[PDB]
Amino acid sequence: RNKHQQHLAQLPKISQSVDDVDFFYAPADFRETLLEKIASAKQRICIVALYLEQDDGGKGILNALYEAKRQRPELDVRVLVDWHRAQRGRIGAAASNTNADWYCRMAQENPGVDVPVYGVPINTREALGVLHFKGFIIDDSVLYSGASLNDVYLHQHDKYRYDRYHLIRNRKMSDIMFEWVTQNIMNGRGVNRLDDVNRPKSPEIKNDIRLFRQELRDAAYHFQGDADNDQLSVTPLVGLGKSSLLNKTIFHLMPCAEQKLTICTPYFNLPAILVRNIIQLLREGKKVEIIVGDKTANDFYIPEDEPFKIIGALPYLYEINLRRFLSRLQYYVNTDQLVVRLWKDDDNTYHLKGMWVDDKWMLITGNNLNPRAWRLDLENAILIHDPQLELAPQREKELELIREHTTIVKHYRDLQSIADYPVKVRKLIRRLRRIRIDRLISRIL
Amino acid sequence: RNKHQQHLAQLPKISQSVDDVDFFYAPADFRETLLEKIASAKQRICIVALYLEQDDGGKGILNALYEAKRQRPELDVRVLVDWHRAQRGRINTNADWYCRMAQENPGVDVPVYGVPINTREALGVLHFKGFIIDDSVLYSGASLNDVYLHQHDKYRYDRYHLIRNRKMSDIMFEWVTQNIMNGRGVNRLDDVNRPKSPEIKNDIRLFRQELRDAAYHFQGDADNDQLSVTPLVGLGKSSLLNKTIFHLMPCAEQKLTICTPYFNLPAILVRNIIQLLREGKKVEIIVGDKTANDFYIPEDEPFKIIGALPYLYEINLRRFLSRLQYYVNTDQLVVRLWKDDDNTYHLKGMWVDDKWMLITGNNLNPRAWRLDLENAILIHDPQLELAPQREKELELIREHTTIVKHYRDLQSIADYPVKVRKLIRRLRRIRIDRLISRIL
Amino acid sequence: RNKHQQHLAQLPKISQSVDDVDFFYAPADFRETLLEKIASAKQRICIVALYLEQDDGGKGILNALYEAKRQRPELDVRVLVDWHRAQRGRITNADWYCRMAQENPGVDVPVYGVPINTREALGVLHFKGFIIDDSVLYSGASLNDVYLHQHDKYRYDRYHLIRNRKMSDIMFEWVTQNIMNGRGVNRLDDVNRPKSPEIKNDIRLFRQELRDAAYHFQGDADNDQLSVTPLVGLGKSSLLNKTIFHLMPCAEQKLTICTPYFNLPAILVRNIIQLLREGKKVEIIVGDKTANDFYIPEDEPFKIIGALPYLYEINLRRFLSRLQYYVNTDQLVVRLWKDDDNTYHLKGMWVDDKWMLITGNNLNPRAWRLDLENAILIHDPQLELAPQREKELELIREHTTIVKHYRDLQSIADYPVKVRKLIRRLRRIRIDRLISRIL
Amino acid sequence: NKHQQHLAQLPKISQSVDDVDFFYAPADFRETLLEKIASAKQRICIVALYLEQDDGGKGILNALYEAKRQRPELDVRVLVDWHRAQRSNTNADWYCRMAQENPGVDVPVYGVPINTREALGVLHFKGFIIDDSVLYSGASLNDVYLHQHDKYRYDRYHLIRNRKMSDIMFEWVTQNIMNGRGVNRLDDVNRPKSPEIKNDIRLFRQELRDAAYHFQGDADNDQLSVTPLVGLGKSSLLNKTIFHLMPCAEQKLTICTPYFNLPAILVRNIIQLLREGKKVEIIVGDKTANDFYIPEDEPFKIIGALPYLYEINLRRFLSRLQYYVNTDQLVVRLWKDDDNTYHLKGMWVDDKWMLITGNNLNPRAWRLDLENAILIHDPQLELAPQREKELELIREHTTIVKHYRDLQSIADYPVKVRKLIRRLRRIRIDRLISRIL
């Protein structure tokens, strides 16, 4: 076998029953499933998310957690979110009380009921590392989504943020992930409770975070494979930095496409190494599908009527990336090998991640497949190997619905050029490219 | 509550008996108390100081340490001083002397460790303070030499508090053990073969980073209605100490009092002072006269470059007062100059109304805020149980003070001796005055 | 008018008679014309070239110079070449210039070396012009076997004779004052000529003097008549570079470019893309990799330098790749020149039927910052040179293939193994980008 | 003084005089290696810079396969430099063939990358660990190092039987190298290419920067001892020990190095010794005994300038210290034996200390490469017969240089060499070269 298939063949793999894999296709279903599993949990609930917001959606979840712990005080309930994100407003907000302040109030308003909220700092400053580990571990199941917990991710109140949602019942995998979180994160240096009113400030734990990050640089799942390559399997993956096992698996996965590779990413900003792989596939005569958001389906996009702000330039920069890429590969568009899809559904937002390799592999991940995710953030995934096509109904239904709100881009010219952009945007971008800062921006966001 | 009181309300606090807090008001009493506690120590003696001098005063202390260890060989005796300071004269070293002492007293184990807080003295010194003896901490800003201990008729005024408290002393003893004594780049000064600074340069860099977020970790056992003590330690701008000093000042409902030897407040503390004055509160600032500074050189003697520092601190005070003369006039801002013949002034601390007392080694200058390893104890006395002692201490501090009623009462550069005047004009020409105020 | 046309409208321009502009279409004709003009020169001969080679071709020229000076000792004969290039083999001439001077006593034919920078790689003499009395015979060609089509193999350049008293004076006088009498210029026919390190500081000061040396003359011609405008430059903000930049957008119909080494600076590429967007036409005539003088046949032993033609091809293929849409609409036309193992050295710019830039400028980052470059800008608003312009382009194109698709150009995968390995090594560490800024 | 203190307080493993065997010739070393491979019962760990696809190297690899066939429970490992092994048909390609032609027999060959590119770090760790012994030489495994086929490369050869030391070294290799990030099998046809593991190597190198032997000293300074040492970078324990070792010479310091290119700090030490009135002996190869030397008849190549550059270094050094040559304090020896090559490393401090090492004592070894050594302390002179016999034979093919002028100057060098060197010194690249080779 070639070195890429060898890498995948020799991945440790946990066996998996087809009956124990449930897909969900809409953020509202995901909300309800999460609540249902919280109610019916008997042993443990481990909620890892980027953030858990002080809004109707997030309240719903935290209240359901307190309620489940009240009814079963022996239940092991933990919430882990990003340290930095939990201690600030959203970008350029009027700004108010933070999530961490709210986690404190909740703990005081519910004495006796023990629902600890830990802040994980992946780096000393947010811009240099965030907690992109994903997983709701409930007893022997993992409900895995890219979604954080807020109004739009949960489709409270009429506007939504599109993600993917998979429930996987598997004792061994959930144990491995629960145990990995316990040892490496929860009991890690520089993790600190956010429900403590006296929680340290970032500068005070700066050195703890540095040592923590180094500990994480080679923390990996350790378990023995129980499944061969002829049966349905799942392989949990985790990584921080360029040489993580996750990153290596993503790298090797792409060339194993004998027919077609499909990619979702919210922000089109692939590292060069993944681009080179894409081009190799196209040269080998294979197919590559790339599903990204329209600029207007980006959560930083500011309507052209409203007052423009600096941050509302990001969707434009991602479009410029897409247009540059397509430009170079228009030949392959024409041969129906390269297919680029733009998702758009009124003013809802796009947050799909993942990778399909033929009909046999499905990577579900929190990984945005950008330079940030490749070096800076703590990322994880589950790799589903389905050599017998047992998930084919669900795989196909999921792709059906993902594509439903998509336009195919048949020509790079169908994408607006900088000339077509609003005036403030146009001036900003020209200023940035003059001094070459566009390249820096694409490596930090 | 406002965010400042909230910070203080939520500080972990160790309970404290009023009977177990003893003030001393004079450097001589402090000397004798130190010797007494060294004699009667049963378990441990941990002496942390900036330096321990090869003079009558310092000898007294080191001899008392050797003597106590001879009489009780199971006693855990340690001395920690600044690495760089111990290996130079003022502007045959102490470290050389520590070596002789160890050779002249074989069998008796009194280790003297040098702590380097940075690779060069100018970029970090050991301003951690504390004599930990069994279950007590005798806390002063004083190093151990002739003047600090008032050997031989001339003295250096500091503050002196003995606090008997098992938990606090344990926390401080244990913190020193783990972070300093067993830290990288700490090296024995009683070893004749001790490395030279360049050889341990990388060790010191790693050490300093370890220190950047080393803090006391302990659970509070006391509420805000009872007498409490809270040990604090820090290195650099965002330490818990620095934050507590920052939040402490605005909690003054009536009056804030500050001692500092060298008037050279960082901007952030100045802004706080001005806010208090604007809110209609009172602010008392007790500093030394230029002549009570230890770098001051009488005008008869040969002038040296270093003897310009007291003048620079006066210029700072005069500039500050100048801007706030309105508040002087309303009897809100009170500036006191301490002066007692040619004795020297080394008072540090912060009083918030009648309720809080910060005792510290912190000179409240930019150096202490970024570069040096600093610590303190925060006494919360919500019931006024220390009121007799607090008032007696302030009584005696003020006794040798003049109140400055007008910034003009302070000499201007024009009034200074000629060599000084020329030096200062040269410095301000090239703007080095601003740099000096950030490194001393 | 837009700022680009304004720049051109306000250029000083010297008037020019259509009868006094003669094109030549082949390197052999150029050789013979040069010899003819050397024989018949009456007042001055100023030969500026990158180099004058110690070969049959170069000998021919130097001998013709000595001979003309013998027959007219009052004739002012000067030869200026690059200081560094004259004192090395290909990857010396100065030694040969010394012998010549000794073997011809009494006859004064001075050969000066111009150092444009302290090291060759940081500046060469790309000034061009044979100034003979009141004429300039202007070519990109140096003087050697192939440039002059001695002995059966040739190097294709362009050749224009322009009789014009004022222009030739301006150029002759500019050379006199700024180069010949410049610091750090040194005779190469002197056996005792200094070594580069000894004049290092002279060269630094010289280069700074050159950084703002420009032609100064009053325009005598409007924009409704045939004109010529001499241009000269060193570094990013030279008047030449500005004129090249402004020239391209004035194409109302079509821009044509010749360059030997396809390696356009980004700013000129952006212009090209703007033209294509405005719906105009752009023609680009470059050499096939095999028509490059560094190309080594695949049978022979490969050498490191024989990777350059490949690097230029990679540049062309990357460019075409991004603009394939415009190829398809017949707007963008890329031509590869190739004629057995002869080599390609065409430079210039055509703006519609109205402007013709003839230059030594390779239109690359090197020429834009490092080298001393010059040109003549011919403005022909009345189409008086149309017969010759069209005949010249006819013959240039004759040995060309049109590239209809970027895929028609070989990719790195198709290259020989040693080449392939070298290029992959270079791109790994990103040195390909540096190379493109120094060659 | 602080130097003796450093040495006094080194942890030291005790050692029996009976369990130290010297060998004096590359052929004996070959045969000893083969003998110990045959008779190994528990483990064979072969660490070398490279193992060549030639008669000499084949001999060794075949002996390894053969021993593993006859005792499948035997723990056989080969570790070589990652980059060196992969430069048409490479050693790594050959290691692959060998593994395919010998199925069932498990002889893993791992490539250690000490840096992302060869020029910035190589595996200069040395040691053949066989059961409870270490056969320690600077030699890699090829024709000349093993004196197959009539031409040889002179190195040093010591067998030290010592359970504890061999365990420490075997265990250190296991944990830090074999199980280290970015170590990769060279007998795998699908082995990654350097760029793919670039980040692994960076993290690996940082792990190595403070990997050191950890063990408790069992021996005082009045008895025969050995102290294994290992290091990467300026502040390694090895480098510190080499630095402190030199000033402890009460009488004389002896140094072997193949390429005379001492760091300034070691030069300063040398000068101090000479000033204190002590003796310093330096044994290097003649330019012609360097393996990059190209005879003047053959076609010159750029790399064949290195022996000349090392000579220029030696001549510059001697020039400055000619006074001490004259007082018979400083003694410089040039080794030369027809067209055989010189690869001696080590340090003798009086009659009491012997450093055996792979360390070329140059700036490269001081910062870039993974180096190790064994430090033998012999305060009772128990190894005196062997020490003296070894030095006897080392010196046998040596000329003493009595005057710096006896060394050729740049003017005397062949023309292509002369032009190259003048070009290099013009732009000051000579100084850079001396820090990377």
Protein architecture, described:
The structure is cut from a larger assembly and holds four copies of chain A. In chain A, helix 1 packs across helix 8 and helix 2 runs parallel beside helix 3. Chain A is globular. Chain A is 35% helix and 20% strand. In chain A, the strands form three sheets. In chain A, strands 1, 6, 12, 13, 14, 15, 17, 18, 19 and 20 form a ten-stranded mixed sheet that branches. In chain A, 47% of the residues are buried. By secondary structure, chain A is of the alpha/beta class. Chain A starts with a helix and ends with a helix. At the A-C interface, loops of A face loops of C.
Using only C-alpha atoms, the radius of gyration of chain A works out to 22 Å
Relative helix content of chain A: 25-40%
Beta content of chain A: 15-25%
Q: SS-based structural class of chain A?
A: alpha/beta
Family (chain D): Belongs to the CDP-alcohol phosphatidyltransferase class-II family.
Pathway (chain D): Phospholipid metabolism; phosphatidylethanolamine biosynthesis; phosphatidylethanolamine from CDP-diacylglycerol: step 1/2
Subcellular location (chain D): Cytoplasm; Cell inner membrane
Protein name (chain D): CDP-diacylglycerol--serine O-phosphatidyltransferase PssA
